[PDB]
């Protein structure tokens, strides 16, 4: 299909070149650098997940943590958060 092409009036209407505003959330560099490969994971979307227990529900993005709430009360003492007042 490397030689196919369509009417130019059907090619000026392709999408905006400015890539996409749907990149995956990567905390560090260790995640990535950026046949079935044609569609294995083309659905590019956010996947931010607890950096402890790897869960996509109830993640505190505030202050750039990305820590679930249940995976947080345990480690709060280690991190530095203290329960006073």
């Amino acid at each position: 299909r490397n030689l196919g092409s369509c009417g130019a009036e059907d090619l000026d209407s392709r999408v905006h070149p400015s890539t996409i505003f749907w990149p995956t959330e990567a905390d560090n560099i260790n995640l990535a650098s950026g046949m079935r490969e044609t569609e294995f994971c083309t659905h590019i979307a956010h996947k931010r997940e607890c950096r402890i227990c790897g869960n996509y529900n109830s993640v505190y993005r505030k202050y750039g943590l990305f820590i679930c709430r249940r995976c947080f009360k345990e480690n709060a003492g280690k991190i530095g958060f203290v329960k006073l007042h």
């Binding site: 505190y60 709060a76 203290v82």
Partner: protein
């Protein structure tokens, strides 16, 4: 020679941050450094449900993190590039009290 330098200090405990200070200022009397500017306290706050699930009365946790900051920038001409190290060594290094320097 003269560079106009700044010292930043950060910490989560009030005791060490008040102990590092005394040592550094006592050490710098000669070079011309002066006291700090105690900055507004940064309050991190998190409210979380006390339970891993929705049950019983709705009870909340209230965690917080205080961060304290003291800034000496009064070295400047009184201290040259090499002489700065003289002041960052005699002090009693503490395991957790990041101190950054920038002219």
């Amino acid at each position: 020679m003269h560079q106009k330098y700044t010292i930043i200090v950060v910490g989560k405990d009030l005791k060490l941050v008040e102990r590092y200070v005394k040592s550094i200022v006592k050490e710098g009397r000669a070079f011309g450094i002066s006291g700090p500017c105690r900055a507004p306290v940064r309050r991190l706050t998190i409210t979380t449900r006390k339970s891993p699930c929705g049950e019983g009365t709705n009870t909340w946790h209230r965690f917080e993190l205080r961060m304290y900051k003291r800034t000496f920038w009064v070295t400047c001409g009184g201290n040259d590039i090499s002489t700065i190290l003289s002041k960052t060594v005699v002090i009693p290094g503490i395991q957790v009290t990041v101190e950054v320097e920038e002219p």
